[PDB]
Design a protein around this ligand. Structure first.
Ligand SMILES: *[C@@H]1O[C@H](CO)[C@@H](O[C@@H]2O[C@H](CO)[C@@H](O[C@@H]3O[C@H](CO[C@H]4O[C@H](CO[C@H]5O[C@H](CO)[C@@H](O)[C@H](O)[C@@H]5O[C@H]5O[C@H](CO)[C@@H](O)[C@H](O)[C@@H]5O)[C@@H](O)[C@H](O[C@H]5O[C@H](CO)[C@@H](O)[C@H](O)[C@@H]5O)[C@@H]4O)[C@@H](O)[C@H](O[C@H]4O[C@H](CO)[C@@H](O)[C@H](O)[C@@H]4O[C@H]4O[C@H](CO)[C@@H](O)[C@H](O)[C@@H]4O[C@H]4O[C@H](CO)[C@@H](O)[C@H](O)[C@@H]4O)[C@@H]3O)[C@H](O)[C@H]2NC(C)=O)[C@H](O)[C@H]1NC(C)=O
Ligand code: PT5
Ligand code: PT5
Ligand code: PGW
Ligand code: D10
Ligand code: CL
Ligand code: CL
Ligand code: CL
Lengths: 332, 344, 353, 345, 352
């Protein structure tokens, strides 16, 4: 066949160990990316999964051919025969290509020696998360790549127009986050080997607060109201009010322990920790209030009217704290 | 001219015996090493190991790979590394490791005119690190990576840190959630096995644990229940149900906190600092409950006897309650002072 | 030997064969006829929104380069022959991490007919995405997809088709079900075209219809909540002077409802919206809390701190005694009636659909 | 037995050997005998519905191309020669994950005999699916099978048989599991039609009976003890309301917590198990005890003044009700236990 | 160059070599001398009943086909040469999923002496089954085995031996200990013959003796149970008229013991027999239950529903209840019996 002899002529005397234009000029690679989905964001390990179709285009004079055929469209078989860029992802903890039913690779060669090489990838990429404003936090997770062995004098990357494409985000696996947008950048990084062109894509994510509202805030508020209920019980019923106070304190301790299970073991205070601590302070103050009331009314012998003052003071103070907290965090 | 480079490389690879090291019968080959640390993750006390990602680079000289006429450092496709001799370096304390392989094998081979070879790999390795948790969570750990030649003795190969103390970089940029890297060290020595002496390099880090997480999680709740246990001293002596319920709840909460805290660690046989603190808090709350029990006994089981017959005095419940009010906070504060002075 | 003729035929077939080129290149479109035998429908993972399936995936096409004549009409060859010839580069569009089984040898078969027809089958374990909308959880249904097609060849080069009628081209084994909390109602089969920046491609799609089984959640979540509500309502029948007992009732029921609410949201992923079970738990929590507030209001109007002595007769309205609260007597009727009405409305709404 | 002669013989055997063709290509089917040595059964998992099995799997078949005269001994060859010979494409249908052990080398064995017979051995660890019916759990019996089949070769090409008959599978009696006891094992040979043809099938099935002691220690005894604890309320005066209410509430919450904790460590199956029925019965008993206290408290306080103004056990005296309960509750619980244990054993 | 001589020697050695045939095939029995250097004894998994071990495993034998004469007495070659020659097919009989490390290169070495003696060493991580009997848990000791031998070659073809005296042929590194809740007391070494369907095979066996450490379970299980028993017995010193308080004591202690009993078995596999800790927990549960029944019996005989007031006087035999004789006897009986039980238990199990 004509195509068979064309391929045999192209591969005759071809050295895949040498990049095109070696010793002449840098090889310019044009990069393109289609994001199938952004997997879950694992805050404990500070990483996220992403599935992409990654495409690279470059010119190779050794692969020029003359015929009526304009394009040779080839499967994964010939990928190992020609020179391929050694692109790798800088911030990748774990990555893998897809191999079922066959290697998910595509090659296309033009008359003028232009080569397009595409493959499907699944990448776990580290994303350092600053959880100070958790669960009202927003993040900008990167994905960086470059050539492993060729410095900028040998390989240069370029993005093309409208480089990064995304499908329908409704089918993505982002439960706790909503995809805001993305941006692309290119820079140069210096290492002991030399200077390398690094190409980065930043994805902006904003956390969704519904799950933590269901899980943490509402139970804490309800337990605080349960502690408030003690003020209307008669002061003579010592076991009942003592039981209310101790049960509220223990439940708040348990909720505080449970709330931080989702986070990593960071050594700073988050917004959730502040809210839970303030709820703990409120219930502890209610129990101490009853303790001093009982001590003054009976054990020793305005003070007797402490319950009436508490009924007004505690709910108003809690409402003021909630207003200040939410206004400070959500808006400012 | 690509043809000249192709002929030069083909000449270099022709007649090359990969089975023999450089200077097979001659003096040992010197191999310089350097590392660029990318990240340290998952410092696990349960598994007693840590994960480490790095760019590991080796430098040596091979006379057989010397060329001339090309004033360039030829960077070649990494597959040619399969056709050249490379050192048989390995890590002794490694448990699981791999070379990253997307889009291709993250491997670099670079030649120079004088036969010098630079060989770089991108490696993620889970290295073992046995930890002494006696002072946990106020403990400092030392975690090391050993680098050694497997088959070649000191007569055949020599290792050195390329660049002296600057051979390892990127340590200052590392950020761990629970630790801070206070120091790192580089050591070069020899180790003797039954098969002979081999060269060894060692890269050690010292990690100091952050205390804020445990203050938020463990110490402050324990102090809070311990303070709550003292409320019983202000309750009337005849309100037995309230005081007993308070004491029992405090004791059970302390026990549950201790158990659920210890359940998230390896089954070590010795006691930790936090275990000592929790045991002290348990003793305090238990003594408060026993104090109420003593007050109730001294009142009810001894009032009739005193009536028939006829530190503070051991016959007045109010005196005992006042003494407990004075003494329990003071003793707890003294215990905290001693504990925090000893461990810090 | 008698087998030498077959060796000569096989050597002749592969002499000059180029597996880099599809059959009919530059002459026509390569048509691939596909079908699937599901040996077992694996478990569904709600946390990952994925599902597993074990399949015999088999494809058929024509290659005139492999025509032969001999004593045998069909050559049933080793799987290693498949690597020497062209085969389609089929891949699953929504697959996550699949496996091609190798024990004891590669689980593939190739059969060549004298006219040049190739049959190529393999055994696969496919893990595929099934996006779920959990608004009606645990009374929700899903249509999990399975989409596949060529990676490198556009519709102008390779086109896929179903071997039989599309309904009968995906056959599920009778005994092959590994679903614990789902029922496979049926499957729908379709084909279509997808567009990308590289060209147009043929996509073959199947949709498996699954319905969740509610028994586990009825035993695990609904019954404890209902019993907690009943336990809270039991407190109305005690005398108003037993303050510690009714306080214990209220506190324990509230804490039990809190624990149940916390533990309910553990099977699902951390979705940002509320499910049906969340609404049920919220209403039950409201009932329990209202019972506690009822007790507090009753205690507010109690005058005497002692209960009825058991011997003295109270006046019809000396030592007086508290009367039975009207709030308790009316709550005894009100609370169970409204709870039953809510249960009727909830279950009718969420089961009629 | 000069090694040069053996090398010449092996080279002659492997010269012109077409690995793509079975031993009797175009001829009658080749008979493959099989036998297994079970080394261990590791992890029978209810959550994942599978079990792990380590075995030595050996296959026997005649290949006339490999017959050799001269050397009078069986040639045990290096395992890599298996890559140069034809072997059956045997596979396990109900397998989820498998591997051949590969330390220090690939644990594989090739033995040739003068008449062309070939013995091919592997050491395989395989995880195999086993769907378990847990309706009678933990008093249940399970049947778990391994299904061996030929992938590409129909009954016209390959035939399977158990070599040695019932003695084909060995080492089952030496297996020891912590939760299960192996009662019986069976071997079956069959044919299966798959619409690409009819293929031979072998099946090795085991019957496992679960051990009850762990669940007696862990689940049944705490429930029985809590139920007995709930009966202490009947011996306390009706006026001591706080004590009786605390006792009943504590017992009810403990029973519910035990049930939830037990059910959280098993697959989310929709049907009801035996242990679930037992725990539900215990829950009903403790709930009825608490309701009994509520009933006597109501009968005294709510309905005492009315009878004072006016002026099965008798439902007017609380002491009579308590005395009746003190007898009836243990008797009913014992009857329920008798019925349950007679039905489920 | 000077290296062309060694290339010619290596080419001559492999010319006509057949790695499919063992040395002395059809003439004599191949003899392999083996020994092990344990670089680290990995952790023991009670749940899986297995253990991990990291070893330099080294074997040595004779191959007359590989003798040479040259300027060097011994050739220390690249490990890929090991794939070009025959080597034993050693495998671990009780081995689970194991790893042969190949980072950066294959962690192997091959050395050839001029007389044809081959030394072959390789670094391994072996997971091996250690069947355990847990009757004396957590005061139990085990002898975990490690067996290896040839997979394909019967005793008539390959036989294994220890390089030096068998005790000294398994050497454990001084710092090589990754055990958390065990002590490695020592090891014993042996060899034997095993029959099978294929034939008779030589097996080389080691047994590592391990002793469990008790501190973790003392802190985790025994101390909470003892404290719960003491907490239950504290209730005997309260006045009999404090019914809710003593009821709270009883119910809380019973629940604590139930929770401890349920949580004590999490670490172990689901064995069908009772361990020592099970007996201890059962006895403690019996003690707290007995305390609650004692309170119930005391309450049954209480007549007056009011406690003693601080002003009046109680005549000896408005009247008042007397202190229960049951409580006064229980205060002595319960602690004494618990102490006797503790003495008997810790005497019989620690000195077992
Ligand atoms: C430590 O030790 C480790 C093990 O001891 C070692 O790991 C092994 O290293 C080797 C070498 O580095 C790896 O081999 C590469 O694997 C590539 C495929 O990789 C992935 O797939 C394998 C499984 O691959 C099989 O299955 C796929 C489909 O699933 C097939 O496509 C493959 O062909 C292959 O075939 C069989 O198995 C199937 C099912 O398993 C069967 O159904 C089928 O019938 C076959 O029997 C996985 O194991 C991999 O998993 C791992 O690795 C990644 C990192 O990469 C990890 O992230 C991950 O976690 C796993 O650990 C992975 O998923 C091969 O493509 C590759 O071979 C090509 O290139 C080399 C040159 O480099 C050629 O010599 C070779 O011939 C291959 O080339 C041809 O084919 C390609 C693709 O079609 C063409 O592009 C190319 O041009 C060339 O075409 C020519 O030849 C053809 C010959 O037939 C011809 O037909 C064509 O027409 C054309 O002319 C190479 O083998 C191996 O995967 C590692 N793992 C294991 C378990 O062995 C590790 O490296 C060591 N570490 C160190 C530091 O030393
Ligand atoms: C492995 C654990 C082992 C733990 C260690 C064991 C430890 C075992 C040992 C512990 C100490 C045992 C002491 C028991 C001995 C009793 C003799 C002394 C008291 C005695 O005689 O008992 C009687 C009743 O008899 C019983 O039913 C009492 C007899 C039944 C006792 C049952 C105890 C229940 C717990 C036993 C153990 C558990 C039992 C349950 C088993 C199942 C669970 C395992 C009650 O004596 P009392 O002192 O309570 O009451 C007096 C008495 O009734 C006077 O007669 C009465 O005056 P009068 O009416 O004028 O005559 C007083 O009234 P006033 O207040 O008006 O003055 C009363 O106050
Ligand atoms: C999610 C859906 C949940 C649905 C829940 C169920 C929803 C459906 C449930 C419905 C609730 C059931 C029944 C409604 C109650 C009927 C009102 C009857 C009012 C009534 O008559 O009660 C009064 C006053 O009470 C109030 O002013 C205050 C009365 C407040 C009204 C009752 C509040 C009940 C609790 C509501 C908690 C609601 C909480 C809501 C929270 C938010 C949830 C979203 C107290 O009645 P009393 O019988 O307690 O007290 C009498 C009374 O004070 C006599 O005047 C007094 O005699 P004198 O002083 O001589 O005149 C007696 O003294 P003696 O003991 O010496 O004989 C007292 O014993
Ligand atoms: C730890 C707690 C212990 C408490 C125990 C107390 C003892 C008394 C209870 C015994 C329950 C017996 C087991 C219950 C049955 C087991 C649960 C079950 O399988 O029922 C399914 C239907 O349920 C359904 O429709 C779900 C809807 C029914 C909901 C049942 C609760 C009724 C609540 C009414 C409000 C009353 C308010 C009164 C207040 C005064 C059967 O469907 P089907 O086979 O077709 O499979 C189709 C697919 O959906 C899987 O089932
Ligand atoms: C960076 C370390 C911050 C530690 C915060 C500790 C807060 C304790 C609040 C009681
Ligand atoms: Cl997410
Ligand atoms: Cl399922
Ligand atoms: Cl251990």
């Amino acid at each position: 066949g004509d195509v068979t002899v064309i391929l045999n002529n192209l591969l005759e005397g071809y050295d895949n160990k040498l990049r095109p234009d070696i010793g002449v000029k840098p090889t310019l690679i044009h990069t393109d990316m289609y994001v199938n989905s952004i997997g879950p964001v694992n805050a404990i390990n500070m990483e996220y999964t992403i599935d992409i179709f990654f495409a690279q285009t470059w010119y190779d004079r050794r692969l020029k051919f003359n015929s009526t055929i304009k394009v040779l469209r080839l499967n994964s078989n010939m990928v190992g025969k020609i020179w391929i860029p050694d692109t790798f992802f800088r911030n990748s903890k774990k990555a893998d290509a897809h191999w079922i039913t066959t290697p998910n690779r595509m090659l296309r060669i033009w008359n003028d020696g232009r080569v397009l090489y595409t493959l499907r990838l699944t990448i776990d990429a580290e994303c350092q998360l600053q959880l100070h404003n958790f669960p009202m936090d927003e993040h900008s997770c990167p994905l960086e790549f470059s050539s492993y062995g060729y410095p900028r004098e040998e390989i240069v990357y370029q993005w093309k127009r409208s480089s990064v494409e995304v499908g329908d985000t409704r089918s993505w696996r982002l439960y706790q986050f909503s995809f805001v947008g993305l941006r692309n950048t290119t820079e140069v990084v210096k290492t002991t080997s030399g200077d390398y062109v690094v190409m980065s894509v930043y994805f902006d994510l904003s956390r969704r607060m519904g799950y933590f509202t269901i899980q943490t805030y509402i139970p804490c508020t309800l337990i605080v109201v349960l502690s408030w209920v003690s003020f209307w019980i008669n002061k003579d019923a010592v076991p009942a009010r003592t039981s209310l106070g101790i049960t509220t304190v223990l439940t708040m301790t348990t909720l505080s322990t449970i709330a931080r299970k989702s986070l990593p073991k960071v050594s700073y205070v988050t917004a959730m920790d502040l809210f839970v601590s303030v709820c703990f302070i409120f219930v502890f103050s209610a129990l101490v209030e009853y303790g001093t009331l009982h001590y003054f009314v009976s054990n020793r012998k305005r003070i007797a009217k402490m319950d009436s003052y508490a009924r007004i003071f505690f709910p108003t103070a809690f409402c003021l704290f909630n207003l200040v907290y939410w206004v400070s965090y959500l808006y400012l | 001219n690509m043809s000249f480079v192709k002929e030069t490389v083909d000449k270099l690879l022709k007649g090359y015996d990969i089975r023999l090291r450089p200077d097979f019968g001659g003096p040992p080959v010197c191999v310089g090493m350097n590392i660029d640390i990318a990240s340290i993750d998952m410092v696990s006390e349960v598994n007693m190991d840590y994960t480490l990602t790095m760019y590991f680079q080796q430098y040596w000289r091979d006379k057989r790979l010397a060329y001339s006429g090309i004033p360039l450092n030829l960077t070649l496709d990494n597959r040619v590394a399969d056709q050249l001799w490379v050192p048989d370096t390995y890590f002794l304390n490694d448990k699981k490791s791999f070379v990253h392989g997307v889009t291709v094998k993250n491997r670099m081979i670079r030649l120079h005119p004088d036969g010098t070879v630079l060989y770089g790999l991108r490696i993620t390795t889970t290295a073992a690190c046995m930890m002494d948790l006696r002072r946990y969570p106020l403990d400092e750990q030392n975690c090391t990576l050993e680098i050694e030649s497997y088959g070649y003795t000191t007569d055949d190969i020599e290792f050195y840190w390329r660049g002296g103390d600057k051979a390892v970089t990127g340590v200052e940029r590392i950020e761990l959630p629970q630790f801070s890297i206070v120091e790192h060290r580089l050591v070069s020595r020899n180790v003797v096995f039954a098969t002979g002496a081999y060269p060894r390099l060692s890269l050690s880090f010292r990690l100091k644990r952050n205390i804020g997480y445990f203050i938020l999680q463990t110490y402050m709740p324990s102090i809070l229940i311990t303070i709550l246990s003292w409320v019983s001293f202000w309750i009337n002596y005849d309100a037995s149900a309230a005081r007993v319920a308070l004491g029992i709840t405090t004791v059970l909460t302390m026990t549950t906190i201790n158990t659920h805290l210890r359940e998230t660690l390896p089954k070590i046989p010795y006691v930790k600092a936090i275990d000592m603190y929790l045991m002290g808090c348990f003793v305090f709350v238990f003594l408060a409950l026993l104090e109420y029990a003593f007050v109730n006994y001294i009142f009810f089981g001894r009032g009739p006897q005193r009536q028939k017959k006829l530190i503070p005095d051991l016959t007045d419940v109010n005196a005992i309650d006042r003494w407990s009010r004075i003494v329990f906070p003071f003793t707890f504060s003294l215990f905290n002072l001693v504990y925090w002075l000893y461990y810090v | 030997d008698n087998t030498t003729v077959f060796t000569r035929i096989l050597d002749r077939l592969l002499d000059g064969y180029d597996n880099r080129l599809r059959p009919g290149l530059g002459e026509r479109v390569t048509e691939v006829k596909t079908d699937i035998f599901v040996t077992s429908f694996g478990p569904v993972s709600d946390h990952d929104m994925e599902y597993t399936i074990d399949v015999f995936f088999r494809q058929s096409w024509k290659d005139e380069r492999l025509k032969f004549k001999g004593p045998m009409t069909v050559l049933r060859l080793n799987n290693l022959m498949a690597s020497k010839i062209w085969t389609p580069d089929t891949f699953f569009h929504n697959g996550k991490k699949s496996v091609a089984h190798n024990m004891t040898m590669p689980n593939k078969l190739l059969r060549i007919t004298e006219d040049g027809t190739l049959l190529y089958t393999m055994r696969l374990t496919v893990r595929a995405e099934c996006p779920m909308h959990l608004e009606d959880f645990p009374m929700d249904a899903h249509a999990c997809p399975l989409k596949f097609g060529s990676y490198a060849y556009t519709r102008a080069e390779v086109v896929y088709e179903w071997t039989r009628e599309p309904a009968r081209s995906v056959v599920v084994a009778e005994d092959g079900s590994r679903l614990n909390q789902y029922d496979l109602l049926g499957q729908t089969v379709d084909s279509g075209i997808v567009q990308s920046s590289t060209g147009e491609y043929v996509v073959m799609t199947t949709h498996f219809h699954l319905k969740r089984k509610i028994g586990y959640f009825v035993i695990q979540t609904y019954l404890p909540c209902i019993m907690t509500v009943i336990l809270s309502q039991v407190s109305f029948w005690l005398n108003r002077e037993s303050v510690p007992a009714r306080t214990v009732f209220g506190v324990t029921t509230v804490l039990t409802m809190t624990t149940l609410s916390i533990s309910a949201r553990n099977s699902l992923p951390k979705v940002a919206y509320a499910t049906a079970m969340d609404w049920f738990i919220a209403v039950c929590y409201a009932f329990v809390f209202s019972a506690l507030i009822e007790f507090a209001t009753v205690n507010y109007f109690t005058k005497r701190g002692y209960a009825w002595d058991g011997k003295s007769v109270v006046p019809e309205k000396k030592k007086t005694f508290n009367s039975v609260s009207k709030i308790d007597r009316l709550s005894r009727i009100a609370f169970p009636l409204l709870f039953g009405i809510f249960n009727l409305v909830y279950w009718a709404t969420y089961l009629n659909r």
